[PDB]
């Protein structure tokens, strides 16, 4: 948990296929009272992020598994 | 010369008569796609042999 700072580091398209635009990882900048710690979570979760109103500056409750 | 000419001619005729594709249907499906299609793609990649799974998400256009 912590204040989120969403950012997607652009990555080359799937190397197994052609070229284009893809996202291999999604970094979330969870900031807690003790400090800050960015998490390079799986990109498939991006759907959940967009589902809820997860904007930069709110507290999110992430689950490990 | 004329020999290879007739060979290629009858080979083309045989190909035509035997043609009496799924890739073309996939390309048609692509045509029908409005264009902003996001593809969820995950493949097994190496680190049975030791390996792992990697996830990729391709975005067609910058709008999405």
């Amino acid at each position: 948990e912590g204040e989120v700072t969403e950012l997607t580091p652009c990555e080359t398209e799937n190397p197994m296929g052609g070229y284009g635009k893809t996202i291999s990882h999604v970094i979330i900048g969870l900031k807690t009272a003790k400090g800050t710690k960015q998490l390079k979570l799986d990109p498939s979760i991006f759907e959940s992020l967009q589902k809820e109103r997860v904007e930069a500056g709110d507290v999110i409750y992430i689950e490990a598994n | 010369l004329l020999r290879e000419a007739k060979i290629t001619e009858e080979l083309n005729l045989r190909s035509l008569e035997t043609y009496e594709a799924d890739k073309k249907k996939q390309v048609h499906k692509k045509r029908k796609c409005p264009g902003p299609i996001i593809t969820y793609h995950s493949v097994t990649v190496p680190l049975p042999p030791a390996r792992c799974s990697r996830t990729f998400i391709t975005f067609s256009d910058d709008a999405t």
Binding site: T12, P15, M16 | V43, V45, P46, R54
Partner: peptide, 16 residues
Amino acid sequence: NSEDAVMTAVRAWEFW
């Protein structure tokens, strides 16, 4: 042979 080059490129991307 093509799949071999594809997986080699995937391994190069993993190393990168």
